[PDB]
Design a protein around this ligand. Structure first.
Ligand code: HEM
Ligand SMILES: CN(C)c1cccc2c(S(=O)(=O)NCCCCCCCCNC(=O)C[C@]34C[C@H]5C[C@H](C[C@H](C5)C3)C4)cccc12
Ligand SMILES: [K+]
Length: 404
């Protein structure tokens, strides 16, 4: 189904890109999205897919719309509209100025000083996961390392016992990949049923952990409500799962297919933090958006109040106006330009934790299993959406080349 073209939208801007099923998916998802940056494609287009919505295709427009929250509201941040409308996590669905207090609170639980403190526990977890795969000589990376890793980091952050992982993983999977057992709202409520009691207890007997902090917090000079804490705790849980899982998978897929890039990192592990940044550009993967708060002319184009606009974080760093030869991976780029963690008032609060997860993973993997490949015969499949990703990543190695 295409949606019929709204009258304010001129025909010459219409490019029916489908964000959940792009034409060139088989060639790689970032590549599939990069067709939007071909020379015949305007900086701002309308697609009739997925209810109909604008797409900003260039880093300059993407950044500008993200800065201008007065015209581009996060009240409805997801395409299609029905998803955007039912979405209530905090702070992702709030605009400044209200979002500012909630964000400061959330920053207390995942900000830089928390990350510096957790780094060693993160390394311990990574090492334990890798060392259990190492002798096998094979894994599905996405399933065997990537999925268990960030959920375990959330348990450590939130002071939750490891016993709860299976149930928690199931509920978050249902929100982003439903098997049918539960609607989004049922999964959401089950999450709330899970967090509500721990919130009440940690209100009464505080810990030094994320759930305590968010529960004992103050916003707008008053105590955070139970509805507000659970909706924040919800985002803190889901925000760092699918992004980390899929990003780690794009990265490992690249390194498996590029011996020369692996060898560089093996020989110069000091370049790993830079390599992380360049991978974050090349394999950027989020595409959310905004809704117009009013009629607005933006870069020659008449936008109407209530129109949705997709602003793909993914596209800014792939824009050849931002980075020369954008599909080329070069770990020594002088200026790595990207909006992989967003831009503007909602810039990812988990970005410092994500970078440490990524760096620790690459450092620990490359020192234990320096030599690996894509399993003989396998063709890696990508998926496209709000968070794009990797269906599966079967890796192989010779265990004699590994270090215990
Ligand atoms: C590769 C990993 C990650 C990527 C690419 C990523 C990406 C993003 C992006 C693009 C936004 C802005 C969304 C918007 O403007 O609508 C965002 C916000 C956010 N992220 Fe991440 N993220 C990652 C990891 C994490 C982690 C590990 C956490 C920890 C829980 C986290 C927590 C959050 C929170 C709480 C917000 C909302 C900030 C606000 O609305 O004020 N993220 N993220
Ligand atoms: C028929 N019709 C109209 C339809 C009906 C229903 C579904 C449809 C789908 S669809 O099934 O493919 N729709 C996708 C469901 C929306 C996913 C919700 C996001 C959850 C992750 N949330 C975060 O808050 C984390 C986080 C974390 C960070 C920051 C920010 C953005 C990203 C990255 C995610 C928040 C496709 C096409 C049509 C559909
Ligand atoms: K909403």
């Amino acid at each position: 189904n295409l949606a019929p073209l709204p009258p304010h939208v001129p025909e010459h801007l219409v490019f029916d890109f489908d964000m959940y099923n792009p034409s060139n998916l088989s060639a790689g998802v970032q590549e599939a999205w990069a067709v939007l940056q071909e020379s015949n494609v305007p900086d701002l287009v309308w697609t009739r897919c997925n209810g109909g919505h604008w797409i900003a295709t260039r880093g300059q427009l993407i950044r500008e719309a993200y800065e201008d929250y007065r015209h581009f509201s996060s009240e409805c941040p997801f395409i299609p509209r029905e998803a955007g409308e039912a979405y209530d996590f905090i702070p992702t669905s709030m605009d400044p100025p209200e979002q500012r207090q909630f964000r400061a609170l959330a920053n207390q639980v995942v900000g830089m000083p928390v990350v510096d403190k957790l780094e060693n526990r993160i390394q311990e977890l990574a090492c334990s996961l890798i060392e259990s795969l190492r002798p096998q000589g094979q894994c599905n990376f996405t399933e065997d390392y990537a999925e268990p890793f960030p959920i375990r980091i959330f348990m450590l952050l939130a002071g939750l016992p490891e016993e709860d992982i299976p149930h928690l993983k199931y509920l978050t999977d249902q929100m982003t990949r439903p098997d049918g057992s539960m609607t989004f709202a049922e999964a959401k409520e089950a999450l709330y049923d899970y967090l509500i009691p721990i919130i009440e207890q940690r209100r009464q007997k505080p810990g030094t952990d994320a759930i305590s902090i968010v529960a004992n917090g103050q916003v707008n000079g008053r105590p955070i409500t139970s509805d507000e804490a659970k909706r924040m705790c919800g985002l803190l849980l889901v925000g760092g799962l699918d992004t980390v899982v899929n990003f780690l998978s794009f990265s490992m897929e690249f390194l498996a297919k590029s011996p020369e890039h692996r060898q560089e990192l093996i020989e110069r592990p000091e370049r790993i933090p830079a390599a992380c940044e360049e991978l974050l550009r090349r394999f950027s993967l989020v595409a959310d958006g905004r809704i117009l708060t009013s009629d607005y002319e933006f870069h020659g184009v008449q936008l109407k109040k209530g129109d949705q606009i997709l602003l793909p974080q993914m596209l800014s760093g792939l824009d050849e106006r931002e980075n020369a030869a954008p599909m080329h991976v070069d770990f020594s780029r002088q200026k790595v330009s990207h909006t992989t963690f967003g831009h503007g008032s909602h810039l990812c609060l988990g970005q410092h934790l994500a970078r440490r997860e990524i760096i620790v993973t690459l450092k620990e993997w490359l020192t234990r299993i320096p030599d690996f490949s894509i399993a003989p015969g396998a063709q890696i499949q990508h998926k496209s959406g709000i968070v794009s990703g990797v269906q599966a990543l079967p890796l192989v190695w010779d265990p004699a080349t590994t270090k215990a």
